C-alpha cells in the first residue's frame, strides 16, 4: 500500500526566512507562507510524529519526536519524498533538542532530565545530568546563550521548573509555585526571564537571575501546551487546549520587575488542543499548528497595522467640529458608509458627514420630518442615502465620489401608508434600485418603488397585498421578482410585473424567526439557488425553478453560536457569515470554520452597520455613547497554510458512491465524502483521486452528541447516528458547479440510550427503504421509510437480551430477509423476518418488493442461528453474498484483537446454518476497529488501535495476512474504501485522516 495524504495532529511550526516548516504527523511540510504554497512534504519518521524541530543557520534540520531523532538537510527535505533512513531511535523519550552554539553537536534532553551531547550523526559523545533524585519531565528546552553558556530548563511532573547549567552540571534554580505538571518552559532571548505554564491554567513569569516569581497570568481556560517570547522579549505568546492563542505584554517597571498583561485572544483551531506556535518578529505574524491538522497564520497587528483600524467619536468630539448644535437628548440614529466616509442622521433629523480623508465632521443639512424615529438605508456602491420615518416620508440623497457634495435629492410621501415601520432597499440593475416600505395596518399594501440611480426619481410604484403572518425583514431582487424575507422563517416572492398575482410563499424554512438575508448564489438551466439566513443561526439554500414556480431546500445548517445577520460568498467561493454572540460581532469563514475578525459592540448592539470596502470591511456601531468605526482589513498573509479537519476522533467515514446521475464535472477528478466525529459534527468535503488533497465544504451541526455512524446509502441519501436516538436521513445535491449541498430530510422517531448501528435495504425502484436500528439496551427495531410521506413507520420491534448490540446488517439470500446482529457477548445472531414483514425478497441481488399493506408492529421472532465467534464485543461487521445469493461470508473484527470469518448458508429447504470458517486469534495487537471485505470477498482490509493497517487474502474460507503498514492516525477507528474502476482508495480515520492507495 502507498500513503498519499495526511491531515492530522501537527505538533510544531517554525518560521525560517519566508518558509514555514511544520512537523505534521511524521512529516515535515515546507510552505512559502506569503502565498500559502506547499513546496514539499517529506516523511522524516517511520511512524512517530515530529514533536519539535529547529534549523541551523546553514540549513541543517534537527527534528525529534517521542524516541525518534534525526538530522537532515533542508535541501533534501525540499525535494525528497522521504528521508526515514536517517531516523534514529533513542532509548528514552526525547523532551527537547537544540543545536550547539556552533552547530557541530546537538543536545538532546530526555524525559528524565539527562542531556545527551551528540555528533551530527546523532551518536552520543557524553551525558550530563544532575545529582539527587530522578525527575520525570513533561516539558523542557535547552537554551544556548553562548558557546559554553547552555541552560537546561526542565518542567517536571511534580510542578517544579528546574533551571541548571549544562556543562558544570550545576543547579541554578528550582522554581516552585505552579500547582500542576509543567507543560512548557521557555526563556527570553535576552536572558532576563523564564516563562512556564501548567495544567493549573496559569502562566508564570520568573526572573532568571534571581529565581523569583514576578507574575502569574490567568487567561487561558484549559491546559496550556506551548509558549515563547517574541518582539525583543517584550511580549509572550501562548497556545492552549482551549483552542486559543493568547498574546501577553511584558510590562517592565522600577517597583515591580515585570508583569504579564493579557493583550489579545485569538480562537484559531478546532476542538481541541493547539500544539505549535512561532512568531516572525519582522512582520508581527504568528503561525500555530493544531490537533485538527490546521496551520493558522495570525496577524498580530490586525488592529494596528495600517493605523486607521479603530476610531471613535462621542457626540462631544463631533460637536467640537460641527459646533455646539445638538439639543438635549439628541443622538445618532443611523449611519451609512460611502467612498468618502460616513453619512449619519440624528434623532432630530440632523444629517452629518464624516470624511475618512480629513477626519472632520460637519453638519450637512436638517430635515425636521425625520426627527420622528428615522431609519437609514443606502446603496453604498453609488453613494445614495435613504432616509425614512414612521410618517411615510422618504428622503434620498446622492453624493459625489471624492467631493461628497449633494448632487441629487428627492423627497416624497406615500399616501397608501398610514404609519411606517420598515424600509428595505436592494440593487436592481445598472440604472435603478428598489425600495420597499411597509406599515403595521393589515389591509394597507406592501409598497415597492423602482427608483433611478441617476436622479433618484420614481420609475414605477408597485402595491402588493400582504399575506397573513408577514413582516418584511430583508430584500433581494431577481429577474422580475422580489424575494422578501419575513418573520417566522417566511419568505414571500412577489412579481414586479403583476401586483395582482398571488405571491409565492415559502413558510417555515427553519425553526427561527427573522429572515436576515437572501443572497443569490448561482443558477443552472431553469433553477436559481439562493442563500437564506435566519437571525437565530439557521441558514438554508433554496432552489427556485421556473417550470409557475416551485422550490426545493438544497442545504440547511445552523451556526455553532450566536445571531446570524448575513452571509455571502467571497471570490474564492467560501461562505462568509457575520452576526453576534451576545456582545461580540463576528465575521466567520463558515466553509473552513475559522474567525476572520471580532469586535466588542454595545451588548444590546442596537445600532450597527457593515459595509464592504476595497481590502475589507468597515463595521460601524454605537457603544457607550460613542460612535465607533472598526476597519477590518483583509489578512496581510493567507489565513491558513492548511485548513484542517476534525480535531477529535473520526468515528466514521463515507464516500458518496459513483452514479449514473448528473454529478457535476468539477467533481470528476475526485470524490465527495463525509467524516463523522466525536466533536458532534459531520464534515462534507472532497478529495482529489490522484493527489489525495482534501477540500472542505460544510460542517453540519444538527447532532447534539458525538457521531457513531454515517453512511451514504446511495448516490443522494446519507444516514448518520449519534446517541440519544439521533438518526438523521440527509439528502445530498451535487448538480452545481462549485460545491455540493446537503439538507436534513427526516429524523428517526425517538422513544438514555444510543443507536449503535443501522443498515438499510431498498424497496426495488421506490426510493423507499427498510431500516434496522439496534440500541444500547439490546432493542432492535425495523422501520419502513416512505419517501412521499417522508416518514419512518415502525414495522417490527424486539430485543436480543440485555447487553449492547454493536452492529447490524441486512442479508438477503434466496427469498429470505435476514437480520444479523453482533452483541457484546461475541455471538453472531441471525433472525429471519420474512414472514413477519409485508415485503418480499427477489431471488437475486435481493431486492425488496412492497406488498402495500398497512402498518402493524410485528414482534421480533426468536433467532434462527446463534454462533459464538469472539470472546467479547464485536467492533466491525461486514458480509459478502455469493453469486447465487444462497450464502454469504461474514467477517468480524473483535475487541479481543481476533478476526473471524463465518459462513451463512441456506439449504434447498431454506434452513439457516451459521458455521465459522476460520479465526485468527492474534490478528492485531489491540482492538480491531474496522474490517471490510473487498474484491468479491477475496480480500480484507482491517484497521486497529495499534495503528497497523493489515491486508488479508481469503482462500477456501481461510484467512492469511499478506501485507501490513503503520499509520500515524492514532486510535485508528474508521475505514472507507472505494474502487477506482482493481486499484482502491482507502480513507483511514481516528485522530487524523489519511488517504492511501492499494
Amino acid at each position: 500500500m502507498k500513503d498519499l495524504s495526511h491531515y492530522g495532529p501537527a505538533l510544531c511550526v517554525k518560521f525560517y526566512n519566508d518558509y514555514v516548516l511544520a512537523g505534521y504527523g511524521p512529516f515535515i511540510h515546507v510552505y512559502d507562507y506569503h502565498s500559502a504554497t506547499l513546496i514539499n512534504k517529506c516523511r522524516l519518521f517511520h511512524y512517530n510524529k515530529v514533536h519539535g524541530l529547529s534549523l541551523s543557520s546553514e540549513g541543517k534540520i534537527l527534528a525529534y519526536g517521542a524516541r525518534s531523532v534525526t538530522i537532515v538537510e533542508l535541501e533534501d527535505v525540499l525535494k525528497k519524498e522521504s528521508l526515514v533512513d536517517f531516523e534514529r531511535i533513542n532509548s528514552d523519550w526525547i523532551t527537547g533538542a537544540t543545536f550547539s552554539f556552533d552547530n557541530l553537536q546537538i543536545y538532546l534532553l530526555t524525559c528524565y532530565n539527562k542531556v545527551l551531547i551528540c555528533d551530527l550523526n546523532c551518536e552520543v559523545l557524553f551525558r550530563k545530568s544532575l545529582g539527587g533524585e530522578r525527575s520525570i519531565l513533561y516539558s523542557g528546552i535547552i537554551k544556548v546563550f553562548g558557546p559554553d553558556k547552555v541552560y537546561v530548563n526542565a518542567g517536571t511532573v511534580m510542578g517544579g521548573v528546574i533551571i541548571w547549567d549544562l556543562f558544570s552540571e550545576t543547579k541554578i534554580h528550582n522554581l516552585l509555585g505552579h500547582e500542576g505538571s509543567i507543560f512548557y518552559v521557555n526563556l527570553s532571548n535576552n536572558g532576563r526571564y523564564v516563562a512556564s505554564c501548567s495544567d493549573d491554567r496559569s502562566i508564570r513569569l520568573w526572573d532568571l537571575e534571581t529565581g523569583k516569581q514576578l507574575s502569574v497570568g490567568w487567561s487561558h481556560t484549559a491546559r496550556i501546551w506551548n509558549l515563547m517570547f517574541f518582539d525583543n522579549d517584550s511580549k509572550l505568546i501562548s497556545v492552549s487546549e482551549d483552542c486559543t492563542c493568547r498574546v501577553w505584554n511584558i510590562i517592565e517597571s522600577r517597583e515591580n520587575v515585570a508583569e504579564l498583561s493579557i493583550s489579545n485572544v485569538y480562537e484559531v483551531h478546532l476542538i481541541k488542543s493547539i500544539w505549535g506556535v512561532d512568531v516572525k518578529d519582522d512582520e508581527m505574524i504568528a503561525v500555530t499548528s493544531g490537533n485538527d491538522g490546521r496551520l493558522k497564520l495570525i496577524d498580530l497587528l490586525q488592529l494596528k497595522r495600517h493605523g486607521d483600524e479603530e476610531t471613535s467619536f462621542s457626540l462631544d468630539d463631533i460637536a467640537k467640529q460641527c459646533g455646539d448644535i445638538f439639543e438635549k437628548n439628541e443622538s445618532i440614529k443611523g449611519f451609512q458608509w460611502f467612498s468618502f466616509g460616513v453619512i449619519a442622521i440624528t434623532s432630530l433629523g440632523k444629517i452629518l458627514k464624516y470624511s475618512d480623508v480629513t477626519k472632520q465632521w460637519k453638519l450637512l443639512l436638517t430635515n425636521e420630518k425625520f426627527n420622528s424615529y428615522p431609519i437609514t438605508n443606502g446603496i453604498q456602491t453609488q453613494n445614495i442615502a435613504v432616509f425614512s420615518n414612521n410618517k411615510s416620508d422618504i428622503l434620498l440623497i446622492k453624493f459625489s465620489k471624492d467631493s461628497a457634495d449633494i448632487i441629487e435629492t428627492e423627497e416624497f410621501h406615500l399616501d397608501e401608508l398610514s404609519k411606517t415601520n420598515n424600509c428595505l432597499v436592494t440593487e436592481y440593475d445598472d440604472d435603478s434600485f428598489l425600495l420597499t416600505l411597509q406599515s403595521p395596518n393589515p389591509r394597507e399594501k406592501f409598497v415597492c418603488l423602482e427608483i433611478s440611480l441617476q436622479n433618484l426619481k420614481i420609475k414605477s410604484k408597485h402595491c402588493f397585498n400582504k399575506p397573513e403572518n408577514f413582516s418584511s425583514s430583508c430584500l433581494t431582487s431577481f429577474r422580475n421578482h422580489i424575494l422578501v424575507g419575513s418573520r417566522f422563517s417566511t419568505l414571500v416572492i412577489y412579481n414586479l410585473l403583476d401586483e395582482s398575482e398571488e405571491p409565492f410563499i415559502i413558510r417555515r424554512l427553519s425553526p427561527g424567526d427573522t429572515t436576515t438575508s437572501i443572497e443569490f448564489v448561482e443558477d443552472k438551466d431553469n433553477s436559481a439557488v439562493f442563500s437564506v439566513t435566519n437571525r437565530d443561526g439557521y441558514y438554508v439554500f433554496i432552489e427556485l425553478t421556473k417550470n409557475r414556480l416551485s422550490y426545493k431546500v438544497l442545504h440547511s445548517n445552523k451556526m455553532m453560536k450566536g445571531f446570524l445577520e448575513g452571509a455571502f460568498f467571497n471570490s474564492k467561493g467560501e461562505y462568509i457569515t457575520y452576526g453576534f454572540k451576545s456582545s461580540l460581532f463576528y465575521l466567520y469563514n463558515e466553509t473552513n470554520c475559522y474567525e476572520l475578525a471580532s469586535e466588542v459592540c454595545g451588548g444590546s448592539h442596537r445600532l450597527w452597520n457593515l459595509a464592504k470596502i476595497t481590502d475589507g470591511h468597515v463595521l460601524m456601531y454605537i457603544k457607550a455613547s460613542r460612535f465607533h468605526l472598526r476597519k477590518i482589513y483583509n489578512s496581510i498573509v493567507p489565513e491558513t497554510l492548511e485548513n484542517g479537519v476534525h480535531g477529535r476522533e473520526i468515528r466514521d467515514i463515507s464516500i458518496c458512491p459513483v452514479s449514473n446521475t448528473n454529478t457535476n464535472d468539477n467533481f470528476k477528478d475526485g470524490h465527495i465524502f463525509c467524516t463523522a466525529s466525536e466533536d458532534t459534527t459531520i464534515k462534507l468535503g472532497y478529495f482529489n483521486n490522484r493527489t489525495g488533497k482534501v477540500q472542505n465544504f460544510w460542517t453540519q451541526r444538527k447532532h447534539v452528541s458525538g457521531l457513531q455512524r454515517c453512511q451514504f446509502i446511495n448516490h443522494k441519501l446519507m444516514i448518520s447516528s449519534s446517541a440519544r436516538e439521533e438518526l438523521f436521513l440527509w439528502e445530498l445535491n451535487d448538480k452545481y458547479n462549485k460545491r455540493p449541498y446537503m439538507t436534513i430530510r427526516q429524523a428517526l422517531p425517538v422513544s438514555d440510550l444510543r443507536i449503535m448501528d443501522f443498515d438499510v435495504k431498498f424497496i426495488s425502484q421506490s426510493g423507499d427503504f427498510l431500516l434496522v436500528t439496534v440500541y444500547s439496551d439490546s432493542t432492535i427495531k425495523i422501520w419502513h421509510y416512505r419517501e412521499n410521506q417522508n416518514k419512518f413507520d415502525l414495522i417490527m420491534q424486539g430485543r436480543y437480551k440485555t447487553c449492547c448490540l454493536f452492529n447490524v446488517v441486512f442479508i438477503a439470500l434466496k427469498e429470505e430477509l435476514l437480520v444479523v446482529i453482533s452483541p457484546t457477548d461475541g455471538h453472531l445472531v441471525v433472525y429471519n423476518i420474512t414472514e413477519y414483514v409485508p415485503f418480499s425478497v427477489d431471488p437475486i441481488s435481493g431486492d425488496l418488493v412492497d406488498h402495500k399493506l398497512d402498518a402493524t408492529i410485528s414482534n421480533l421472532p426468536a433467532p434462527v442461528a446463534q454462533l459464538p465467534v469472539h470472546q467479547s464485543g464485536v467492533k466491525s461487521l461486514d458480509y459478502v453474498a455469493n453469486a447465487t445469493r444462497t450464502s454469504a461470508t461474514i467477517l468480524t473484527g473483535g475487541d479481543d484483537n481476533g478476526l473471524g470469518l463465518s459462513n451463512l448458508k441456506l439449504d434447498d429447504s431454506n434452513k439457516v446454518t451459521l458455521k465459522t470458517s476460520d479465526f485468527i486469534a492474534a490478528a492485531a495487537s489491540s482492538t480491531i476497529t474496522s474490517g471490510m471485505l473487498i474484491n468479491g470477498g477475496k480480500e480484507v482490509i482491517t484497521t486497529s488501535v495499534d495503528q497497523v493497517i493489515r491486508a488479508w487474502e481469503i482462500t477456501a474460507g481461510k484467512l492469511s495476512l499478506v501485507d501490513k503498514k503503520r499509520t500515524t492516525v492514532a486510535d485508528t477507528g474508521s475505514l472507507e474504501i472505494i474502487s477506482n474502476d482493481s486499484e482502491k482508495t482507502l480513507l483511514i480515520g481516528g485522530v487524523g485522516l489519511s488517504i492511501w492507495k492499494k
Partner: protein, 231 residues
C-alpha cells in the same frame, strides 16, 4: 457520568472504577481465594479499588479467613482512610516504602499487587501511552520484590500502538500474561488491564527497570493472550 458513576454513589464507592476490579474478579477470581492474605494497592487515590479490597476480604469474608489479612494502599496524594486498609502517603520509587510496606507485613511477600493508576490524558496519544508505561514500569519496581513468587500483579494499561512491547518486556517475569477489558471500561477509552498471573522469576538518579527491560527486550513485540472478564 455513565451507568457506573451513579451505581458507585449508590454503593458508597469512591469512583466508578471500583467495578473494573469487581468485573475483573468475576474472572480470574484472585480475590475469591480463602487463602488470600496480603495485598498492595498502588497509586490507589481516591481509593475505590482499596474499598473493593476491603469489602471483599473483610466485610464479605468468613472470620476464619480474616487472619493476618493486611491491605496497604499507596499514593503520593493523601487518601481518606478506609476500614481495614493502611494508607501510606509515599512514593513507590523511594527507599523505605519498600521496607515500610514489608514491615507492615510479617516480612511476608504480598500475594497480589494491583494498580489502577493513570495520569490525565493530554490527547497526545504517543505521550499518553509512554507516560502510562512509565507508571507501570516504576510500579513493577516494587512488585518485583514484595510479590510472592507465583502471585498475581494487575495494572491498567493504555492498549495502543506500543502495547506489544510491554507484553514481551513482561514475558520474562510471568507464567501467563493476560489482557482484559471489563465492561465498566468505557468504549471511548484505550483502557485495558494487564492481569499477570503466576509471578515467575525476577532477576538476580541511576539505572532503573525501564532501562534494563529496555536493555534486554529490545525493540521486540509480542501479543499477550486476551481475556474478557465480567459475566
Amino acid at each position: 457520568r455513565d451507568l457506573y458513576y451513579r451505581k458507585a454513589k449508590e454503593q458508597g464507592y469512591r469512583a466508578r472504577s471500583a467495578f473494573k476490579l469487581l468485573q475483573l474478579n468475576d474472572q480470574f477470581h484472585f480475590l475469591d481465594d480463602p487463602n488470600l492474605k496480603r495485598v498492595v494497592d498502588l497509586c490507589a487515590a481516591p481509593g475505590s479499588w482499596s474499598q473493593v479490597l476491603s469489602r471483599k476480604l473483610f466485610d464479605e469474608s468468613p472470620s476464619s479467613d480474616k487472619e493476618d489479612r493486611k491491605i496497604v494502599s499507596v499514593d503520593l496524594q493523601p487518601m481518606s482512610p478506609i476500614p481495614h486498609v493502611t494508607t501510606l502517603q509515599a512514593d513507590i520509587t523511594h527507599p523505605k516504602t519498600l521496607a515500610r510496606i514489608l514491615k507492615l507485613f510479617g516480612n511476608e511477600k504480598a500475594d497480589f499487587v494491583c494498580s489502577d493508576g493513570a495520569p490525565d490524558v493530554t490527547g497526545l496519544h504517543d505521550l499518553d501511552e509512554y507516560v502510562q508505561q512509565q507508571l507501570i514500569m516504576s510500579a513493577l519496581q516494587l512488585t518485583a520484590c514484595i510479590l510472592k513468587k507465583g502471585g498475581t500483579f494487575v495494572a491498567k494499561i493504555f492498549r495502543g500502538r506500543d502495547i506489544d512491547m510491554l507484553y514481551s518486556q513482561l514475558g520474562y517475569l510471568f507464567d501467563k500474561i493476560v489482557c482484559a477489558k471489563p465492561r465498566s471500561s468505557r468504549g471511548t477509552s484505550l483502557e485495558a488491564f494487564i492481569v499477570c498471573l503466576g509471578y515467575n522469576p525476577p532477576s538476580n538518579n541511576k539505572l532503573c527497570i525501564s532501562d534494563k527491560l529496555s536493555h534486554w527486550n529490545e525493540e521486540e513485540r509480542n501479543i499477550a493472550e486476551f481475556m474478557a472478564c465480567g459475566s
